[PDB]
């Protein structure tokens, strides 16, 4: 048709594009809030749109995103500097309130639903998935903490169907009160598991699941998030933990 | 035989779970393929089922017969022995009617032979398989975005042997057939049009292919990094922002200087895919009847 | 200690004995004194 | 929401008109007619 | 600057030795212990494109040229603009890339995500550095490299890019495009994937993780999971870098001749050695 | 009200004009007529 | 603790408190000098 | 719902008067018959 | 129901008068037979 | 643990011991050092 | 008040002038006709 | 301690004098016409 | 009941009314046999 | 059975009868001899 | 353990026991090693 | 048990001779001399 023609519909329309896209990327999180709960200093060169249609996956009603941004979940920090930019500091222990590394938020009590008529996640004792018949079978195995010390025995699996991949290692204590712990943070070398995230004297800090079967969405934030709690902090400052944090490969 | 429980990765197998039933069919889905548990403790291990009929036994069969059309022009030169066939499994070659016959299908089986048949069986091997990334995208009630990166993908296929070399009066302007043949054409459209560098359409067609290792070099790293929280389930993180959507919405803001959402990261991933072969769709749709040279196009618009 | 709503911070007088006492170090020595820096400029060398 | 106040006019709106300056300046300072900076000696 | 849920994540540390000495948030941008270093490297290298401008003859980004050192000066240096200024931008840019890939680790120890992100820019330091530290280092001097520009190395990738004949002939390269065409094969889908969940046709329920085994199994027949496409999307884009370094670790230092002279060790076989056949015959 | 200075005026706003001052000192010199220091030896 | 529905702010009367200082008069002398420092340029040099 | 206004006229339609203003201004300046403003040289 | 109505048939109705018009305005303004806005001399 | 008002930290009385000894005399250990250091720079070599 | 006196006041004046002077040395090294030992060459 | 002793000036100033000496080496060891160690044969 | 009805009559209605027309308009406009609008002087 | 019926019947009439027609409409106009819409003139 | 005043830290007089041996004598013998070198470099051989 | 009585000798027996003939027929088929399908003509 022409030598210089189609490009002047490319630097104009397709340049009206990173202005149409970056907003569809700056929805969740925005609008901007400061460090207490207050209309912020700005929003950006790509201002945020008012949310559109999001029909919910399991008839859960009406929620519009960008959605919850305000201060509903509990926050507590002891300020060391007042001007915006410098970090904050926990009041008590940083493993107590949940400020800094271990991150979560208050969600509504409903287990992730998929399809057939039951929750997304269940163990092997309930959802009789795959059993044990012939040969020697490694279900019921000892574990080691980040302090290089025995913690508990994992004796059951949490199975899956659509994605065929187990998710949790239910650590039952001697008390019988079960403690929960995610999947992409564990490494077993030989016969006994060795953890490097949480010591064997900090496992009750992660509270228990009130239902041994229900996997609600309020409770999938700390169980897989507290592992970060001892990834930032643990453990200052001298001695045997320095030979357990630095170096290494995997 | 039993099924092992290796030391924490982990896995438990899936039994007889097909999927959903609303608009698809399931009777043609005859048998769930035998599960190759290839120590499937990393990804998955599931085969079947799938959609069967004639919206399907046409792409395979036209793929086949297109696939069959170029391969016997590899056995044609061999000497009728299977030794030369794998020795030149690539050195053999095949093209359409001569640059002085072109549009004419009247080329015999001797010379400009087996290009009119493969492109005839290809033309029902990808225009009824784009009618299955667009139709099975409704087999339940979903969108069609899957065939909106496939309608700008068979668009670089809508110049190379369709729209250029048919209203240009030449089949030799359509691509040779096989493994080695078409590479004396990826270095033939290059000596000819004056080096396609100063051609910022093929050139900025490349500027949407060097960026799909700038969006996927980090996507398979970062969603493998937020996984220790629970953002691998990409259908409970968008509206119901998960705890892997607060281990990611700060990172790239702090780093390079802009974050996305869990609906947001799939909107730059396919705005660096629907424009790969589109700017090069326009970047082989303008390398023809405009200015034949791009060295004699790169001295008229580019410094002026 | 935690904070509340608009407009901490803010707010006073950590905005009046602080932010008022740090900001005007860029709206005078670069606003009015730059016109004294204009002195050796506003004729060297625009006029030929 | 949508657009706030005390952050744009300090570092962003300061390079919104300066950006709009050099997209006007870099055009009218090179035409074979005007100049008014080099054309003042010869 | 911070998001609405960025009230809590704000915690100091992360950096190596000394303290929170460098770790201050400037804007949305993270200026950590590798922060005023990348402010140091950035405000030092943009003028390293404007240095080779008063000499070469081109201030314009069109044809700015800081050429690689001459092919034959040795293990020391070069002239000025033709290798010297080239050798100045050598530890300014490569000084910045890892003032940033271990400053990402100043955001990975700070929280507790997977250490897999400061790992994918690392292949960007395994195809670029297959051009400075690898090939130029041995066969003589830094002369076996390219000018820095946006165009100069283009007509360097073209004209001086047929020196191994026809490069499609190269088998390390071929298969460092065969991971560069499937690069975008598993993204044009994966990208449409999680838009059609929330927004189907109009007003229809959102989808769940079991409508992925009735669509892609309803597609090509394979379904390695929902996190099995962030582990076959990193099998797409990182590997177009070190099988390309492969035909830049074997190409010019061992076989500086044609690599179309490579596909004639497939016919030299006692079976079909003294007996030609197809095409060749 | 709002905004920040005890963080933004110590090493964040003082070079905001170093964005605008030092980026236009470069242009005022390279000119082969203005110069003010460059061309005076020939 | 934070805020409520659209908009807040808002709000009456909080709209004309933080959106009428460097936006109403902040873009008024910017327009004044856009006629003041333009009328001395209306004549030089569109004319030779 | 589904779309916006306090974001499509305060910052969108207000840039729709600058996006469309200058584009053809230099399309009718590239075509040499108007010019229209260059009264200086002549 | 069907497709977006309070979203799809208003703000994207613009590109029906925007992108459609412009590309058909493209192969038209150039042809030395038309031009129409180049006629000046007589 | 944190205090109340203006300002911290800190730190009365450290308005004339911390923010004037390494802050205002910094405009002396480099600004006044420039007075004697520049007396042999402005002529090397703008006047060749 | 605020900021840092026992921290970021002896380190905001050690990599700040070195990030405004010694990086600025490179542009007056970008001369090779001036230059404080290149005068022998030109 | 005003600054850090066994942290900022036992090896970190060792890469301060080292960050200066060698970046200029490839300016003085370089140069098209100085050398006096390379050009001794030709 | 195996496929759709609603979605075809608004968004997929264009691929039979426009794209069919627009990429066919181009070929009949070209051939120097019709013109209508290229007639001008004929 | 295996399959449904009465909803594909508005697209198997929609775009089908032209998926058979478009390719056959493109071979009879290529020959300069017939054309019928090009030759019924002189 | 930290104190109060300036520098503290400091840490008076850890400001004159560690800012003396390697700060002064480190940079004074970085001035007794750098100045001297020049005296075989200034003229060999920038003059050519 | 051990040997497929039902599985192998009916459905896998078909593809055994099938493959034992397919690409071995593609050896001495239409050879330069033999043929015996191209011969009984000329
Ligand atoms: C516009 C310029 C040319 C062209 C430029 C190039 C260049 C450059 C390259 C190719 C390459 C390829 N091209 Mg091509 N190609 C064109 C456009 C096409 C189109 C199309 C129009 O839709 C198709 C179907 C193809 C087909 C192909 C593949 C066979 C091959 C690898 C692509 C890839 O990365 O997928 C990989 C993933 C897939 C799922 C594709 C499946 C194909 C298999 C997996 C790869 C084939 C490797 C080899 C030939 C097989 C040998 C097996 C032997 C028995 C040992 N090309 C046009 C005609 N194309 C690459 C190549 O290596 O060529 C041989 C290559 O570098
Ligand atoms: C001198 C060398 C020139 C040059 C010479 C050429 C030539 C010649 C060509 C290109 C083209 C292109 N160049 Mg170039 N190019 C240069 C520099 C580069 C560089 C670089 C060194 O940075 C790169 C990475 C590239 C690569 C590219 C691409 C951006 C572009 C083609 C896109 C494509 O292949 O997708 C194609 C993908 C598709 C069409 C999708 C497939 C759709 C089909 C219909 C579906 C069939 C799938 C099939 C069923 C699969 C079967 C699966 C089986 C079941 C296994 N060029 C230099 C400057 N380049 C090509 C182009 O088109 O220009 C824009 C082209 O012809
Ligand atoms: C008589 C012609 C005057 C002049 C006529 C104007 C007008 C009109 C304007 C400016 C404006 C500006 N001029 Mg002036 N200006 C001149 C030529 C120059 C030259 C030069 C290359 O010689 C420079 C570097 C400048 C510098 C500047 C900027 C500081 C300022 C644009 C700010 C903005 O963001 O918008 N002017 C000559 C000396 N200039 C803009 C401004 O900010 O207002 C003063 C503006 O409207
Ligand atoms: C005869 C012509 C040859 C050919 C000529 C060449 C030449 C010459 C080269 C290649 C190279 C490659 N070719 Mg080839 N190539 C051919 C045609 C093709 C085609 C095609 C479709 O036809 C394709 C897809 C390719 C693709 C490939 C890759 C396998 C390989 C480049 C790897 C890479 O980019 O990562 C590597 C990534 C990097 C080097 C980037 C490093 C990352 C850095 C750290 C980040 C930069 C940041 C930046 C400075 C800052 C900017 C950001 C802003 C601040 C915002 N070639 C034909 C066969 N090709 C290159 C190669 O193999 O060497 C490695 C190469 O030199
Ligand atoms: C030299 C003057 C040019 C011209 C160059 C411009 C430029 C530049 C613009 C307009 C703009 C306008 N022009 Mg005009 N315009 C001209 C003559 C026309 C003719 C005609 C030939 O009858 C038409 C249909 C238009 C179209 C239009 C309108 C859409 C718009 C202002 C009127 C309105 O608000 O509605 N122009 C003459 C030929 N026109 C404005 C616009 O389109 O933005 C909304 C704008 O920026
Ligand atoms: C021959 C002398 C050169 C010169 C080359 C340099 C170099 C090199 C530097 C200085 C630096 C400085 N110069 Mg001087 N400087 C000149 C041009 C000027 C002019 C002017 C209006 O022309 C002024 C007012 C100054 C004054 C100054 C100071 C602002 C600054 C010293 C530290 C500081 O920030 O306070 N220079 C002349 C043209 N200037 C230093 C600096 O940038 O601050 C850290 C520095 O490294
Ligand atoms: C196989 C690895 C693939 C890859 C991965 C990858 N790239 C990445 C990342 C990852 C994971 C990031 O996390 C980081 C990022 O921010 O995300 C986009 C990045 C990045 N990839 C970028 C660019 C890039 N990556 C490329 C390629 C690739 N990246 C590969 C395909 C390419 C091409 C096309 O080759 C480019 C141009 C940057 C946007 C960003 C790197 C951010 C960064 O590290 O900034 C540091 C730089 C400075 C502080 C500036 C100082 C440098 C000097 C001042 C000047 C430098 C001189 C030099 C010659 C520059 C010239 C540039 C061009 C003219 C060549
Ligand atoms: C945005 C540009 C990117 C892109 C996008 C893209 N590619 C796509 C798509 C999209 C949206 C699809 O929807 C489609 C897809 O379904 O992906 C899996 C596809 C696709 N892209 C593919 C490849 C591909 N991607 C490419 C690249 C790219 N595609 C870019 C990166 C290229 C290039 C570079 O040219 C190619 C060649 C395929 C994986 C797939 C195309 C699916 C298809 O059309 O196949 C139809 C099915 C057949 C032809 C079956 C026949 C099989 C053989 C032909 C017969 C021989 C085997 C047979 C089994 C004989 C044995 C006998 C038996 C009966 C026993
Ligand atoms: C929801 O689910 C799904 C998705 O998600 C949305 C998807 O996207 C997709 C679609 C995605 C894909 C199909 C991508 C899958 C890609 C792969 C599985 C990768 C496969 C890659 C290959 C087969 C390439 C292999 C290359 C080989 C073997 C080359 C041989 C190797 C060499 C010659 C060695 C090279 C070394 C050399 C040359 C050294 C040289 C030295 C000297 C010369 C000396 C599917 C199906 C899906 O189901
Ligand atoms: Fe993904």
mmCIF file with all atom_site columns, C-alpha atoms in Angstrom, chain E residues 35-123:
data_model
loop_
_atom_site.group_PDB
_atom_site.id
_atom_site.type_symbol
_atom_site.label_atom_id
_atom_site.label_alt_id
_atom_site.label_comp_id
_atom_site.label_asym_id
_atom_site.label_entity_id
_atom_site.label_seq_id
_atom_site.pdbx_PDB_ins_code
_atom_site.Cartn_x
_atom_site.Cartn_y
_atom_site.Cartn_z
_atom_site.occupancy
_atom_site.B_iso_or_equiv
_atom_site.pdbx_formal_charge
_atom_site.auth_seq_id
_atom_site.auth_comp_id
_atom_site.auth_asym_id
_atom_site.auth_atom_id
_atom_site.pdbx_PDB_model_num
ATOM 1  C CA . UNK E 1 35  ? 21.489 0.326   45.805 1.00 0.00 ? 35  UNK E CA 1
ATOM 2  C CA . UNK E 1 36  ? 23.815 3.322   45.979 1.00 0.00 ? 36  UNK E CA 1
ATOM 3  C CA . UNK E 1 37  ? 26.108 1.001   44.032 1.00 0.00 ? 37  UNK E CA 1
ATOM 4  C CA . UNK E 1 38  ? 23.632 0.713   41.152 1.00 0.00 ? 38  UNK E CA 1
ATOM 5  C CA . UNK E 1 39  ? 23.084 4.446   41.501 1.00 0.00 ? 39  UNK E CA 1
ATOM 6  C CA . UNK E 1 40  ? 26.875 4.562   41.169 1.00 0.00 ? 40  UNK E CA 1
ATOM 7  C CA . UNK E 1 41  ? 26.977 2.308   38.097 1.00 0.00 ? 41  UNK E CA 1
ATOM 8  C CA . UNK E 1 42  ? 23.935 3.794   36.350 1.00 0.00 ? 42  UNK E CA 1
ATOM 9  C CA . UNK E 1 43  ? 25.061 7.417   36.610 1.00 0.00 ? 43  UNK E CA 1
ATOM 10 C CA . UNK E 1 44  ? 28.407 6.435   35.085 1.00 0.00 ? 44  UNK E CA 1
ATOM 11 C CA . UNK E 1 45  ? 27.594 4.292   32.052 1.00 0.00 ? 45  UNK E CA 1
ATOM 12 C CA . UNK E 1 46  ? 24.950 6.321   30.231 1.00 0.00 ? 46  UNK E CA 1
ATOM 13 C CA . UNK E 1 47  ? 27.800 8.757   29.565 1.00 0.00 ? 47  UNK E CA 1
ATOM 14 C CA . UNK E 1 48  ? 29.905 5.806   28.402 1.00 0.00 ? 48  UNK E CA 1
ATOM 15 C CA . UNK E 1 49  ? 27.596 5.843   25.398 1.00 0.00 ? 49  UNK E CA 1
ATOM 16 C CA . UNK E 1 50  ? 28.103 9.610   25.149 1.00 0.00 ? 50  UNK E CA 1
ATOM 17 C CA . UNK E 1 51  ? 31.888 9.395   25.508 1.00 0.00 ? 51  UNK E CA 1
ATOM 18 C CA . UNK E 1 52  ? 32.407 7.681   22.154 1.00 0.00 ? 52  UNK E CA 1
ATOM 19 C CA . UNK E 1 53  ? 30.537 10.577  20.549 1.00 0.00 ? 53  UNK E CA 1
ATOM 20 C CA . UNK E 1 54  ? 32.902 13.560  20.620 1.00 0.00 ? 54  UNK E CA 1
ATOM 21 C CA . UNK E 1 55  ? 35.539 11.342  19.003 1.00 0.00 ? 55  UNK E CA 1
ATOM 22 C CA . UNK E 1 56  ? 33.817 8.858   16.685 1.00 0.00 ? 56  UNK E CA 1
ATOM 23 C CA . UNK E 1 57  ? 31.627 11.578  15.172 1.00 0.00 ? 57  UNK E CA 1
ATOM 24 C CA . UNK E 1 58  ? 28.152 10.522  16.284 1.00 0.00 ? 58  UNK E CA 1
ATOM 25 C CA . UNK E 1 59  ? 26.432 11.859  19.402 1.00 0.00 ? 59  UNK E CA 1
ATOM 26 C CA . UNK E 1 60  ? 23.173 10.276  18.229 1.00 0.00 ? 60  UNK E CA 1
ATOM 27 C CA . UNK E 1 61  ? 22.152 6.879   19.701 1.00 0.00 ? 61  UNK E CA 1
ATOM 28 C CA . UNK E 1 62  ? 21.775 5.853   16.051 1.00 0.00 ? 62  UNK E CA 1
ATOM 29 C CA . UNK E 1 63  ? 25.501 5.256   15.523 1.00 0.00 ? 63  UNK E CA 1
ATOM 30 C CA . UNK E 1 64  ? 27.342 5.710   18.822 1.00 0.00 ? 64  UNK E CA 1
ATOM 31 C CA . UNK E 1 65  ? 30.394 3.445   18.697 1.00 0.00 ? 65  UNK E CA 1
ATOM 32 C CA . UNK E 1 66  ? 32.586 2.224   21.543 1.00 0.00 ? 66  UNK E CA 1
ATOM 33 C CA . UNK E 1 67  ? 34.280 -0.498  19.498 1.00 0.00 ? 67  UNK E CA 1
ATOM 34 C CA . UNK E 1 68  ? 35.968 -3.593  20.990 1.00 0.00 ? 68  UNK E CA 1
ATOM 35 C CA . UNK E 1 69  ? 39.780 -3.394  21.323 1.00 0.00 ? 69  UNK E CA 1
ATOM 36 C CA . UNK E 1 70  ? 41.864 -4.202  18.241 1.00 0.00 ? 70  UNK E CA 1
ATOM 37 C CA . UNK E 1 71  ? 42.344 -7.855  17.296 1.00 0.00 ? 71  UNK E CA 1
ATOM 38 C CA . UNK E 1 72  ? 46.117 -7.672  17.724 1.00 0.00 ? 72  UNK E CA 1
ATOM 39 C CA . UNK E 1 73  ? 47.415 -5.653  20.683 1.00 0.00 ? 73  UNK E CA 1
ATOM 40 C CA . UNK E 1 74  ? 47.657 -8.404  23.291 1.00 0.00 ? 74  UNK E CA 1
ATOM 41 C CA . UNK E 1 75  ? 46.910 -8.907  26.980 1.00 0.00 ? 75  UNK E CA 1
ATOM 42 C CA . UNK E 1 76  ? 46.828 -5.298  28.186 1.00 0.00 ? 76  UNK E CA 1
ATOM 43 C CA . UNK E 1 77  ? 44.520 -2.793  26.504 1.00 0.00 ? 77  UNK E CA 1
ATOM 44 C CA . UNK E 1 78  ? 43.955 -0.867  23.277 1.00 0.00 ? 78  UNK E CA 1
ATOM 45 C CA . UNK E 1 79  ? 43.727 2.644   21.807 1.00 0.00 ? 79  UNK E CA 1
ATOM 46 C CA . UNK E 1 80  ? 41.231 5.050   23.405 1.00 0.00 ? 80  UNK E CA 1
ATOM 47 C CA . UNK E 1 81  ? 37.736 4.865   21.900 1.00 0.00 ? 81  UNK E CA 1
ATOM 48 C CA . UNK E 1 82  ? 38.446 1.702   19.920 1.00 0.00 ? 82  UNK E CA 1
ATOM 49 C CA . UNK E 1 83  ? 38.964 -0.446  23.021 1.00 0.00 ? 83  UNK E CA 1
ATOM 50 C CA . UNK E 1 84  ? 39.893 1.742   25.986 1.00 0.00 ? 84  UNK E CA 1
ATOM 51 C CA . UNK E 1 85  ? 36.484 3.306   26.569 1.00 0.00 ? 85  UNK E CA 1
ATOM 52 C CA . UNK E 1 86  ? 35.268 -0.159  25.620 1.00 0.00 ? 86  UNK E CA 1
ATOM 53 C CA . UNK E 1 87  ? 37.286 -1.446  28.577 1.00 0.00 ? 87  UNK E CA 1
ATOM 54 C CA . UNK E 1 88  ? 35.811 1.230   30.850 1.00 0.00 ? 88  UNK E CA 1
ATOM 55 C CA . UNK E 1 89  ? 32.197 0.160   30.294 1.00 0.00 ? 89  UNK E CA 1
ATOM 56 C CA . UNK E 1 90  ? 33.361 -3.406  30.981 1.00 0.00 ? 90  UNK E CA 1
ATOM 57 C CA . UNK E 1 91  ? 33.225 -3.195  34.783 1.00 0.00 ? 91  UNK E CA 1
ATOM 58 C CA . UNK E 1 92  ? 30.600 -0.437  34.852 1.00 0.00 ? 92  UNK E CA 1
ATOM 59 C CA . UNK E 1 93  ? 27.757 -2.459  33.335 1.00 0.00 ? 93  UNK E CA 1
ATOM 60 C CA . UNK E 1 94  ? 28.930 -5.831  34.647 1.00 0.00 ? 94  UNK E CA 1
ATOM 61 C CA . UNK E 1 95  ? 29.445 -3.954  37.908 1.00 0.00 ? 95  UNK E CA 1
ATOM 62 C CA . UNK E 1 96  ? 25.765 -3.015  37.883 1.00 0.00 ? 96  UNK E CA 1
ATOM 63 C CA . UNK E 1 97  ? 24.142 -6.281  36.777 1.00 0.00 ? 97  UNK E CA 1
ATOM 64 C CA . UNK E 1 98  ? 25.204 -7.999  40.005 1.00 0.00 ? 98  UNK E CA 1
ATOM 65 C CA . UNK E 1 99  ? 24.759 -4.865  42.060 1.00 0.00 ? 99  UNK E CA 1
ATOM 66 C CA . UNK E 1 100 ? 21.179 -5.952  41.459 1.00 0.00 ? 100 UNK E CA 1
ATOM 67 C CA . UNK E 1 101 ? 21.088 -9.749  41.191 1.00 0.00 ? 101 UNK E CA 1
ATOM 68 C CA . UNK E 1 102 ? 22.423 -9.924  44.742 1.00 0.00 ? 102 UNK E CA 1
ATOM 69 C CA . UNK E 1 103 ? 20.356 -6.892  45.700 1.00 0.00 ? 103 UNK E CA 1
ATOM 70 C CA . UNK E 1 104 ? 17.383 -9.060  44.783 1.00 0.00 ? 104 UNK E CA 1
ATOM 71 C CA . UNK E 1 105 ? 18.810 -11.348 47.469 1.00 0.00 ? 105 UNK E CA 1
ATOM 72 C CA . UNK E 1 106 ? 18.483 -8.244  49.640 1.00 0.00 ? 106 UNK E CA 1
ATOM 73 C CA . UNK E 1 107 ? 14.755 -8.811  49.141 1.00 0.00 ? 107 UNK E CA 1
ATOM 74 C CA . UNK E 1 108 ? 14.807 -12.618 49.357 1.00 0.00 ? 108 UNK E CA 1
ATOM 75 C CA . UNK E 1 109 ? 16.477 -12.989 52.756 1.00 0.00 ? 109 UNK E CA 1
ATOM 76 C CA . UNK E 1 110 ? 14.336 -10.095 53.987 1.00 0.00 ? 110 UNK E CA 1
ATOM 77 C CA . UNK E 1 111 ? 11.102 -12.085 53.696 1.00 0.00 ? 111 UNK E CA 1
ATOM 78 C CA . UNK E 1 112 ? 11.358 -15.781 52.810 1.00 0.00 ? 112 UNK E CA 1
ATOM 79 C CA . UNK E 1 113 ? 10.383 -16.625 49.247 1.00 0.00 ? 113 UNK E CA 1
ATOM 80 C CA . UNK E 1 114 ? 12.180 -19.192 47.087 1.00 0.00 ? 114 UNK E CA 1
ATOM 81 C CA . UNK E 1 115 ? 15.731 -18.399 46.014 1.00 0.00 ? 115 UNK E CA 1
ATOM 82 C CA . UNK E 1 116 ? 14.866 -18.845 42.338 1.00 0.00 ? 116 UNK E CA 1
ATOM 83 C CA . UNK E 1 117 ? 14.552 -15.252 41.093 1.00 0.00 ? 117 UNK E CA 1
ATOM 84 C CA . UNK E 1 118 ? 18.160 -14.047 41.561 1.00 0.00 ? 118 UNK E CA 1
ATOM 85 C CA . UNK E 1 119 ? 18.722 -17.058 39.315 1.00 0.00 ? 119 UNK E CA 1
ATOM 86 C CA . UNK E 1 120 ? 17.020 -16.264 36.017 1.00 0.00 ? 120 UNK E CA 1
ATOM 87 C CA . UNK E 1 121 ? 18.880 -13.011 35.398 1.00 0.00 ? 121 UNK E CA 1
ATOM 88 C CA . UNK E 1 122 ? 21.925 -15.229 35.919 1.00 0.00 ? 122 UNK E CA 1
ATOM 89 C CA . UNK E 1 123 ? 21.519 -16.659 32.418 1.00 0.00 ? 123 UNK E CA 1
#
